[PDB]
């Protein structure tokens, strides 16, 4: 039926829209492949400055679609989250629905998270006997270690205001999509060279160790 | 009475109660040994999932009434155990936590704070650096608020503690916040909680020399002339 | 002509006043040298316990108008404000722009009055504020420091207090100082210096960061795009 992701080109921007609302926009190999290709297309256009991740229906992203790992290897979900943090593009998540489990990590790995009245964020992994090890670093770099780990242990649900007050969302309002035009106007005041250097410097100051992607991937598989 | 800790066994849980309300529940070698033994008892029971630290009277814990290379003081070893235990560790704070009493709560996975909860590091007023407690406070509040609160001997009520991350939950009474927290913890298991706490240590580690360095800094400032 | 810094001595304290209000208190080689000399003077006096950085007019500090391992003077000064045995206190009752934000953020305590504004404007000129960012992020956390940089976000006193950029906020930063000094009088220079040393033990900056941060600012000023964005401003 419909492809996992619909791509829309704009002025200096590429939008990837999660486009399976009837399945609650879950993460399958197809979604991860399509989002990577979309970021590749955006990065391959030297005039592109911004990558916008948005969605459809009641669910922004519901996490793994349930319908051995070599020493040193990492799973594709980890790789995609690291790319959203390391892209020369400004990455912007427009959250106007429920982000559940791996869907939280997907939003959190973006440079800016915009949350509307329908936004909800909840890591449900401990209820399935899992540690959300791949998502956690991307949440903890926003919320700090205590709120990320306590929210995991409690499967805490954040609405838009709660997400904004803990740093999981950068901006909050009635509708995330209506927050986007002023964000794009502001990003148009800088350039891709500058945004790239800024995100590379964030990795210099707040690095993730070389073994973490493997260790996080292995912990998710081991359980 | 003289017994620093009373142990209450429960359904999938062990409670350690600081049980010297008239002495204001001070930290002495006896309290630290009794808490370590209670955590040993809880961990040895394979059906135990939760360790609850609670107290009595106006004071949750008033702290202490005022080294070989590589060695760590028992206070350091106990706080590190509360962060690394396979049990979910829960502090129920319905009174004043002062000096080392702050670190004892802060080292727990979840801090519940009631209307009478207060948190204050008073060490700089005695010429001390609270070096052993600070890593467990900063892992909750972040570095700036931990260090600024230490320099200013800042007092936090339950609301202020909740806003800065020192408390995870706040309400009229910390003990009344416990039943829903335990119901929530029942949806996971000890295997998962242990793995989550081990991953927190993987992602946000304390280096292997820190317990010794922190222990030394407290001992060396008891000795400083300005301190007495 | 005009001295960038006016020094005022008090009991237990030395106050460095940025004293060029009609120039908006800009960062130049002279300001950085003068502040380093003031800090030397303050540290040399064994009865000095507090170094107070305060300013004049509408701007606290408007900001600015490599051999291997070398650090720029701005980096050296910010690091000194974090390593000084003195309690370092920024009194912000005006606009802190660009490098001005890092100068406040490197103090142990930031006091913000109603007129305080903090804004990293560097990305609008094609720059990364690499030397100030570690001193901002050690207060706000990485996400708010980097997002505020990407958006050139302006913080008022309330916003700065909520995110940890300011430790204290009130009507006037200058009037939050006497209660802060009364509190600091309950401890001593020995204890303050040991606490700041322990912050460096718990939350260190690696040995190459100052050089890497200094180099990134020099690289960005040389980017072809930088002159065109300055032209835009
Ligand atoms: Cl995960
Ligand atoms: Cl201590
Ligand atoms: Cl800078």
Numbering used by the authors:
A (entry chain B): -3 to 63, 71 to 226
B (entry chain C): -3 to 62, 72 to 233
C (entry chain A): -3 to 61, 72 to 239
Quoted passage from the original study:
During biosynthesis by multi-modular trans-AT polyketide synthases, polyketide structural space can be expanded by conversion of initially-formed electrophilic β-ketones into β-alkyl groups.
The final VirD model consists of a trimer in the asymmetric unit with r.m.s.d. between monomers of 0.2 Å (202 Cα), whose solution relevance was confirmed by SAXS analysis (CRYSOL21).
